[PDB]
Paper text:
The binding of RBD to the receptor hACE2 is an essential step for virus to entry cell, thus we first explored if the binding of six SARS-CoV-2 variant (including Alpha, Beta, Gamma, Mink-Y453F, Mink-F486L and Mink-N501T) RBDs to hACE2 were changed in comparison with wild-type (WT) SARS-CoV-2 (the first strain of SARS-CoV-2 which was isolated from a clinical patient on Jan 6, 2020, GISAID: EPI_ISL_402119) RBD. Given that residues at positions 417, 453, 486, and 501 are involved in the interactions between the RBD and human ACE2 (hACE2), it is important to understand the detailed binding of these novel variant RBDs to hACE2. To further elucidate the molecular mechanism underlying the binding of these SARS-CoV-2 variant RBDs to hACE2, we prepared for RBD-hACE2 complexes and obtained five crystal structures, namely Alpha RBD-hACE2, Beta RBD-hACE2, Gamma RBD-hACE2, Mink-Y453F RBD-hACE2, and Mink-F486L RBD-hACE2 at a resolution of 2.9 Å, 2.6 Å, 2.8 Å, 2.4 Å, and 2.7 Å, respectively. Each complex structure was comprised of one copy of the RBD-hACE2 molecule in one asymmetric unit.
Residue numbers in the entry:
A (entry chain A): 19 to 614
B (entry chain B): 333 to 527
The structure:
Amino acid sequence: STIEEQAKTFLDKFNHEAEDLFYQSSLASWNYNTNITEENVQNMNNAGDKWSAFLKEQSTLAQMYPLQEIQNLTVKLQLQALQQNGSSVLSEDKSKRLNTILNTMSTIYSTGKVCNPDNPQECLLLEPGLNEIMANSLDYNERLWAWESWRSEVGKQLRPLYEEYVVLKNEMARANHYEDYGDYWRGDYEVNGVDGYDYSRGQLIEDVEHTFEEIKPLYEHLHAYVRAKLMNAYPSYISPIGCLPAHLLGDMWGRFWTNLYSLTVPFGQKPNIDVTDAMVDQAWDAQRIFKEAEKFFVSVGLPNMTQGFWENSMLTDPGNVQKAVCHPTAWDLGKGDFRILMCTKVTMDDFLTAHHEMGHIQYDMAYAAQPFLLRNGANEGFHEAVGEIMSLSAATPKHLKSIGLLSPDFQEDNETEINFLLKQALTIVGTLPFTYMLEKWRWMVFKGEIPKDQWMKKWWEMKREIVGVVEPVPHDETYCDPASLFHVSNDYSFIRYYTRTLYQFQFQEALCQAAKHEGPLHKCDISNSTEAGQKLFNMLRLGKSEPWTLALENVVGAKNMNVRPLLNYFEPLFTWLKDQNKNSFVGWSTDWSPYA
Amino acid sequence: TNLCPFGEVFNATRFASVYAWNRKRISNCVADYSVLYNSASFSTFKCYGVSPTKLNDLCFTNVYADSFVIRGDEVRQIAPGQTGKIADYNYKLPDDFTGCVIAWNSNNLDSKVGGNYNYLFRLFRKSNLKPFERDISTEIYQAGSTPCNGVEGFNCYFPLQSYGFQPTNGVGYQPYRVVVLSFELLHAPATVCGP
Ligand SMILES: *[C@@H]1O[C@H](CO)[C@@H](O)[C@H](O)[C@H]1NC(C)=O
Ligand SMILES: *[C@@H]1O[C@H](CO)[C@@H](O)[C@H](O)[C@H]1NC(C)=O
Ligand SMILES: *[C@@H]1O[C@H](CO)[C@@H](O)[C@H](O)[C@H]1NC(C)=O
Ligand SMILES: *[C@@H]1O[C@H](CO)[C@@H](O)[C@H](O)[C@H]1NC(C)=O
Ligand SMILES: [Zn+2]
């Protein structure tokens, strides 16, 4: 028997162990997340530990079969995914040092607390204490205190650990034959051995930077409009030509500008479409919310939810003393077991989230027939992109009217649509420069292009130049401000939010063309379009078995990330923004800072 | 008026693993086949050659009842000219099969919280099974060229794999009990008529 045929038999055994052992771990994880007890944490760890040990074992055995002697690509993809050393390429001491560093940074982030001056007992955590300030406070000094104290007392702890984390991660990555840890992260987009569909790791940098150049005019005009609105509210704090102070952006980092809506709403006289009252007036419950989402997917030709979904999911808060993690999550346990965990309330937001989460379930069910290792999104940005476009269609006035929630006597006017596109842009557009500047800073740190004695100097130079945000307090190299964000201190790659955002509008534009939608893209609803569900399903069922370039082409007809659908979505706002900024300065000086 | 012992087959407490499928020979009795086909309690009732509709007006020399448990997605494989793990390695029906295949969901019986691992299936074999062949061997499968020495290791796998049957599995992974009725016609006394 050849090496390939040995590999197929080895993967045959792995898949069958892996269903059951992953299923037991998922089932133990489910019981804890729905019923928080000390016994459930133990069982979750025991089941999780055996799965981790099995994966370890199986990775070592997979390394027996040389990839160079395998021709079948779908076999080679499965072995390569299982073969990856990860941290197990370092010596045993160094992997233990790295794991200790990762746990300490995670613990510092989740337990870091700030106490106000003159009361060492009234202390706040990031969640919910400091997050509440950064999302709801209008007071300049209260926001400044939360922004600075989080970075000065928690971020400074992370600075020595993050330096050692950079050294050890680069050591694993170069031992795995990558240039550096950032090059390792970019491997999630790499495709080899498929004529017409290949994609190199370095190509991702070029495509991200090329598409970001076309985003700049829209972001600059968003930035100028936001600065002008905030300058009216804080005349003595904001320069007409300067960067936006980093602590006046709606959250702890300025990751999203969502909470600036109240101070920047163009027409604050026209109320939002809030369909919550209609839901309560009609005595909707959580099951009704999820049946309505189910009918939405059935309307485009997708299957209904399984019987096990209705019996096994937790769609409401358990309540009295059985206590649960209420973060909305879609679960793929394997063996045809699909569930949603969600403490659903009767609100418009939860109604949209249900469509979002069930979009994940539809993606999971579509590739359930794939081999175990290929049951995932095409790349790291595909799965969330599928979820986002479901809430795009479900939120439109056209869709809310068709389901009896929005009054037929409500007609769209251009002022409410500028209001809606602004708030979309504050969240969706505003995060793109933030997401790009951060991942490039990490990419440059990993590549060796930023010395340690210039980490924060270069971090805030790129904030001013690329994001147009300026720190309100000078920060020396004892700070580790990037690590003050969850994804940085918890060792998660971040470019996935940039790519996903471009993907979702590529998906929506393609599906809406298949649905033969007329008018602006942001008013589209793909409901009742089997042609649109079919073209979506042709990618969903692929899972991870095909290159993400080909999976993208199935939906949109193009092989690469494209920014034009994103700009097409926001063009009505872009035109309105340019007219608003005609007597305003567009762009920012990087030298101005609030501390002069 | 001796009634054929079908309840012993269909209503058995425990079914056999498909790799070691039971066969019970049925002889010298009266079979009311119409009761089974007109009971509305099976999810699959498909007959090949013979017709389920009131062909308990026929006499057969012997009747064989083969029973086992497989998952729901593998029930297609119990049919002539099918391929797959069950059809190739565990239970194989001939191309000219004359008989009926009966299956029903048994999640309430063969599933258990934490997993029921009582039922096995053969995952590896050197070759495919002949029709109505049974292999209960536990020889370690030699995937490579190095002998296994009777223990599992690199390229050496135990040939049987267990179903993990949990009540929360999807329908395709839930256990299904299967009964295969074979109607043999020999140049012979034809002892099973069953009005
Ligand atoms: C919660 O877990 C405990 C054991 O940790 C168990 O005895 C109890 O039945 C569970 N409750 C629910 C509602 O699942
Ligand atoms: C790869 O192997 C699978 C199963 O072993 C087979 O179905 C598929 O056709 C093979 N692909 C190629 C290109 O040989
Ligand atoms: C889903 O639809 C099928 C028809 O294709 C139907 O047989 C089944 O009962 C439905 N299940 C649910 C939970 O609606
Ligand atoms: C199995 O038991 C049920 C209930 O006792 C009965 O109706 C059915 O006929 C039995 N099966 C057979 C094959 O007799
Ligand atoms: Zn999501």
